[PDB]
């Protein structure tokens, strides 16, 4: 039950390159950065050059909740991604301020995820890692149609990031290390908190 996907085409569209840039920045500055850091901005999002492996599992009408203050459809997919996608950030370190440049890359997800096209727009909400225990047990309902869909227990989900690589470009190293550490932890949270159902990325 596979979904081929025109990555050539997709990796090209800027409406999408942007707007995930924007998604990130918006949610980023919603956090509290520590004192060694400033003007932390995603400068450049870049997809793989390889797509993910996409297995359709259910179609539905988008949940009510996507409807908010047909011709619409909502794919429950398995995403598997061990590809070459990279985020390019930029911050100021802290007598003086040193501008730094980072890359996040080597992002690994193997994931259940809702994809919902409606009224011109696309919503991407991750649900959980396939190897999440909560699946093995009938202890977390991932049928979005669907009583008690992601009821309690939802908060016990395992990280959706399976792995991730952040590299940057005196004893300021104490800070560029552990800067690198902060970002990971942040970025993980940014996904857990703002990209995983009940939350989602929004685009068009």
mmCIF file of N, CA, C and O in Angstrom, residues 79 110-113 125-132 134-135 140 142 150 157-160 196:
data_model
loop_
_atom_site.group_PDB
_atom_site.id
_atom_site.type_symbol
_atom_site.label_atom_id
_atom_site.label_comp_id
_atom_site.label_asym_id
_atom_site.label_seq_id
_atom_site.Cartn_x
_atom_site.Cartn_y
_atom_site.Cartn_z
ATOM 1 N N UNK A 79 5.302 7.117 8.061
ATOM 2 C CA UNK A 79 6.518 7.750 7.553
ATOM 3 C C UNK A 79 7.704 7.008 8.093
ATOM 4 O O UNK A 79 7.828 6.821 9.299
ATOM 5 N N UNK A 110 10.579 7.098 12.481
ATOM 6 C CA UNK A 110 9.738 6.054 11.907
ATOM 7 C C UNK A 110 8.400 6.011 12.625
ATOM 8 O O UNK A 110 8.254 5.485 13.751
ATOM 9 N N UNK A 111 7.417 6.539 11.898
ATOM 10 C CA UNK A 111 6.354 7.296 12.488
ATOM 11 C C UNK A 111 5.005 7.007 11.900
ATOM 12 O O UNK A 111 4.869 6.806 10.705
ATOM 13 N N UNK A 112 4.005 7.034 12.765
ATOM 14 C CA UNK A 112 2.624 7.154 12.361
ATOM 15 C C UNK A 112 2.304 8.623 12.291
ATOM 16 O O UNK A 112 2.654 9.373 13.202
ATOM 17 N N UNK A 113 1.650 9.049 11.223
ATOM 18 C CA UNK A 113 1.434 10.470 11.016
ATOM 19 C C UNK A 113 0.220 10.753 10.128
ATOM 20 O O UNK A 113 0.072 10.159 9.053
ATOM 21 N N UNK A 125 0.507 16.218 11.201
ATOM 22 C CA UNK A 125 0.512 15.968 12.616
ATOM 23 C C UNK A 125 1.093 14.577 12.862
ATOM 24 O O UNK A 125 0.566 13.576 12.378
ATOM 25 N N UNK A 126 2.200 14.508 13.589
ATOM 26 C CA UNK A 126 2.794 13.212 13.879
ATOM 27 C C UNK A 126 2.033 12.660 15.062
ATOM 28 O O UNK A 126 1.491 13.428 15.864
ATOM 29 N N UNK A 127 2.001 11.337 15.148
ATOM 30 C CA UNK A 127 1.175 10.621 16.093
ATOM 31 C C UNK A 127 2.055 9.853 17.036
ATOM 32 O O UNK A 127 1.954 10.027 18.231
ATOM 33 N N UNK A 128 2.900 8.971 16.509
ATOM 34 C CA UNK A 128 3.878 8.293 17.351
ATOM 35 C C UNK A 128 4.807 7.430 16.562
ATOM 36 O O UNK A 128 4.551 7.104 15.409
ATOM 37 N N UNK A 129 5.893 7.063 17.235
ATOM 38 C CA UNK A 129 6.894 6.160 16.705
ATOM 39 C C UNK A 129 6.191 4.814 16.605
ATOM 40 O O UNK A 129 5.514 4.415 17.556
ATOM 41 N N UNK A 130 6.336 4.121 15.472
ATOM 42 C CA UNK A 130 5.703 2.786 15.283
ATOM 43 C C UNK A 130 6.101 1.774 16.384
ATOM 44 O O UNK A 130 5.277 0.983 16.880
ATOM 45 N N UNK A 131 7.364 1.842 16.799
ATOM 46 C CA UNK A 131 7.894 0.965 17.833
ATOM 47 C C UNK A 131 7.493 1.412 19.231
ATOM 48 O O UNK A 131 7.964 0.862 20.222
ATOM 49 N N UNK A 132 6.631 2.421 19.317
ATOM 50 C CA UNK A 132 6.123 2.854 20.597
ATOM 51 C C UNK A 132 5.405 1.649 21.194
ATOM 52 O O UNK A 132 4.590 1.021 20.527
ATOM 53 N N UNK A 134 3.064 1.739 23.258
ATOM 54 C CA UNK A 134 1.639 2.010 23.455
ATOM 55 C C UNK A 134 0.789 1.417 22.325
ATOM 56 O O UNK A 134 -0.414 1.187 22.481
ATOM 57 N N UNK A 135 1.440 1.179 21.197
ATOM 58 C CA UNK A 135 0.880 0.361 20.139
ATOM 59 C C UNK A 135 0.804 -1.152 20.439
ATOM 60 O O UNK A 135 -0.294 -1.722 20.368
ATOM 61 N N UNK A 140 -3.389 2.765 23.411
ATOM 62 C CA UNK A 140 -3.449 4.113 22.843
ATOM 63 C C UNK A 140 -4.134 4.016 21.499
ATOM 64 O O UNK A 140 -3.646 3.321 20.616
ATOM 65 N N UNK A 142 -5.105 4.935 17.989
ATOM 66 C CA UNK A 142 -4.660 5.785 16.876
ATOM 67 C C UNK A 142 -5.577 5.723 15.667
ATOM 68 O O UNK A 142 -5.172 6.063 14.560
ATOM 69 N N UNK A 150 -6.349 9.074 20.629
ATOM 70 C CA UNK A 150 -5.273 9.710 21.398
ATOM 71 C C UNK A 150 -5.830 10.263 22.705
ATOM 72 O O UNK A 150 -5.667 11.434 23.013
ATOM 73 N N UNK A 157 4.099 9.228 25.118
ATOM 74 C CA UNK A 157 4.687 8.800 23.845
ATOM 75 C C UNK A 157 6.195 8.875 23.872
ATOM 76 O O UNK A 157 6.761 9.715 24.542
ATOM 77 N N UNK A 158 6.842 8.006 23.121
ATOM 78 C CA UNK A 158 8.290 8.025 23.031
ATOM 79 C C UNK A 158 8.665 9.055 21.975
ATOM 80 O O UNK A 158 7.839 9.367 21.129
ATOM 81 N N UNK A 159 9.897 9.575 22.015
ATOM 82 C CA UNK A 159 10.291 10.623 21.098
ATOM 83 C C UNK A 159 9.970 10.201 19.679
ATOM 84 O O UNK A 159 10.028 9.057 19.364
ATOM 85 N N UNK A 160 9.609 11.142 18.838
ATOM 86 C CA UNK A 160 9.417 10.843 17.454
ATOM 87 C C UNK A 160 10.740 10.917 16.689
ATOM 88 O O UNK A 160 10.903 10.298 15.628
ATOM 89 N N UNK A 196 3.364 17.247 16.906
ATOM 90 C CA UNK A 196 2.750 15.997 17.146
ATOM 91 C C UNK A 196 1.365 16.321 17.610
ATOM 92 O O UNK A 196 1.171 17.127 18.526
#
